[PDB]
Every structure is written in structure tokens, then in C-alpha cells.
């Protein structure tokens, strides 16, 4: 009997690895690893990891000017 507030992040392997890399650079991101498709993340960092990940993925996309 113990509740812990947070954000449940559901995603795929590729997004999971990126979140781990972001968590390694900034420790507080990931609170706990739940499964290969779920992560518990800090509520304050939800709006930041979601915004940061898109910036990282922007490199893989070719935006013509």
C-alpha cells in the first residue's frame, strides 16, 4: 500500500532508448523502469522530455528550407 505520483510514459524501444539517454544526461527524468514499453517519469520533466525528444528526432527528418 504505497502511492507514488508521476507520469506513465508508453512508447516503443526507439523512444525508450532516447529517454534513457536524456535521463543519463539529466538524472531526474526517469523515476523507474516498468517494462520494455512503459517508464515512470518525473511530472515536471514530462513537458521537457516531450519537447526535447522532438528536437533530437528533427535531425533524422529532412526539412527542405
Amino acid at each position: 500500500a504505497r502511492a507514488r505520483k508521476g507520469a506513465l510514459v508508453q512508447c516503443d524501444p526507439s523512444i525508450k532508448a532516447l529517454i534513457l539517454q536524456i535521463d543519463a544526461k539529466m538524472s531526474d527524468i526517469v523515476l523507474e523502469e516498468l517494462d520494455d514499453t512503459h517508464l515512470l517519469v518525473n511530472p515536471s520533466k514530462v513537458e521537457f522530455v516531450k519537447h526535447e525528444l522532438n528536437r533530437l528526432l528533427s535531425k533524422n527528418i529532412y526539412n527542405p528550407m
Binding site: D12, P13, S14, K16, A17, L18, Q21, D36
Partner: peptide, 12 residues
């Protein structure tokens, strides 16, 4: 072809 989890980690 989505990169498998194992390979992808090294790509980072």
C-alpha cells in the same frame, strides 16, 4: 524497417 532495440542502443 524499424531498428531492433539491441542495435539501436549502439547507434546513439
Amino acid at each position: 524497417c524499424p531498428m531492433t532495440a539491441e542495435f539501436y542502443q549502439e547507434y546513439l
